[PDB]
Amino acid sequence: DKATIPSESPFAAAEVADGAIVVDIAKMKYETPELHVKVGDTVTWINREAMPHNVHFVAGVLGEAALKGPMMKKEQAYSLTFTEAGTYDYHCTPHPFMRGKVVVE
Ligand SMILES: [Co+2]
Numbered sequence: 001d002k003a004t005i006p007s008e009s010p011f012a013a014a015e016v017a018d019g020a021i022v023v024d025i026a027k028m029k030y031e032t033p034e035l036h037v038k039v040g041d042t043v044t045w046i047n048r049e050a051m052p053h054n055v056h057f058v059a060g061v062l063g064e065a066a067l068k069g070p071m072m073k074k075e076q077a078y079s080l081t082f083t084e085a086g087t088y089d090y091h092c093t094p095h096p097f098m099r100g101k102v103v104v105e
Contacts, residue, residue, distance in 0.1 A: 001063040002084040006042065010076040013046050020044045020079075023100065025053050025072070025092075030100035037104055042081040047072035054078070055100070056093045068093055 016022065021041060024031040026048040037043060047053050052071040055078065059066045062080075072078050082088065082104040092098040 002082065002086070002088075003057075003062045003067065004081045004083060006079045006081065008070070010070055010072045010078050013075040013077050016044050016046060016077050017042075017079075022046055024048055028095065029098055033100045035100070035102045037082060037102060039085055039104055040081070040083065041104070042079050043102055044077050044079040045072065046077040047074060050074050053092045053095065053098070055080075055090045057088060057090045061088055061090070 021035070021037055021043050023035055023043060023045045025045055035043060045055055052073050054069040054071050056069060057067045069078055082102060085104050088102045088104065090100055
């Protein structure tokens, strides 16, 4: 497994940690679709819109099993800590046309 999860469930946008690396979700898109971070960094998605969304990494990306994140409602957030270098593609489960990637160096 190449990621650890600070919080299995979503939490309010206001509760996002100081210093967070943030990807907003708005207008049916990941607003930073190509994010560059370092091994060990935590990325936090924040959903800005009324339509709930998640992040979903297919099997073979963060590990052997898919990682289907929980749905973030409006003004909710979710974090993943990347523990290995690589380019990690993801999508929103019911909106697979929404795609993004985290490049971990
Ligand atoms: Co969605």
